[PDB]
Amino acid sequence: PHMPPLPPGWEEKVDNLGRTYYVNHNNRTTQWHRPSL
Amino acid sequence: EHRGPPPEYPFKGM
């Protein structure tokens, strides 16, 4: 199914092994799980 | 699951 949008403050990045991860610029944190509204 | 945590936050951007 489709991808719901990212919430404010979050960025989607890809690491040097090709793995998607998510960056929270409000918290200055990263995580694997896609955030949801 | 994944090998390791994800890359650290890009703190130099602060």
Residue numbers in the entry:
A (entry chain A): -3 to -1, 193 to 226
B (entry chain B): 234 to 247
Task: Quote the study on this structure.
Several sets of host cell machinery facilitate this process, including proteins of the endosomal sorting complexes required for transport pathway, which mediates the membrane fission reaction required to complete viral budding, as well as angiomotin (AMOT) and NEDD4L, which bind one another and promote virion membrane envelopment. AMOT and NEDD4L interact through the four NEDD4L WW domains and three different AMOT Pro-Pro-x (any amino acid)-Tyr (PPxY) motifs, but these interactions are not yet well defined. Here, we report that individual AMOT PPxY and NEDD4L WW domains interact with the following general affinity hierarchies: AMOT PPxY1>PPxY2>PPxY3 and NEDD4L WW3>WW2>WW1∼WW4. Comparative structural, binding, and virological analyses reveal that complementary ionic and hydrophobic contacts on both sides of the WW–PPxY core interaction account for the unusually high affinity of the AMOT PPxY1–NEDD4L WW3 interaction.
To obtain structures, we screened a series of different high- and moderate-affinity AMOT PPxY–NEDD4L WW complexes for crystallization. Two such complexes, AMOT PPxY2–NEDD4L WW1 and AMOT PPxY2–NEDD4L WW2, yielded high-resolution crystal structures (1.52 Å and 1.74 Å, respectively). All five of our new structures exhibit canonical WW domains, with three-stranded β-sheets and canonical positioning of the two eponymous Trp residues. In all three WW–PPxY complexes, the PPxY core elements bind in an extended polyproline II helical conformation across the concave WW sheet. Each conserved residue in the PPxY motif makes canonical binding interactions: the first Pro/Leu residue binds in the “XP-groove,” where it stacks against the second conserved WW Trp residue (Trp525 in WW3). The second PPxY Pro packs against a Tyr/Phe residue from the second β-strand (β2), and its carbonyl oxygen forms a hydrogen bond to the hydroxyl of a conserved Thr (in β3). The fourth Tyr residue of PPxY binds in the characteristic “Y-pocket”, forming a hydrogen bond with conserved His (in loop-II between β2 and β3). Thus, the core WW–PPxY interactions are very similar in every case and apparently do not explain why AMOT PPxY1 binds WW3 with unusually high affinity. In contrast, the PPxY2–WW1 and PPxY2–WW2 complexes make few favorable contacts outside the core.
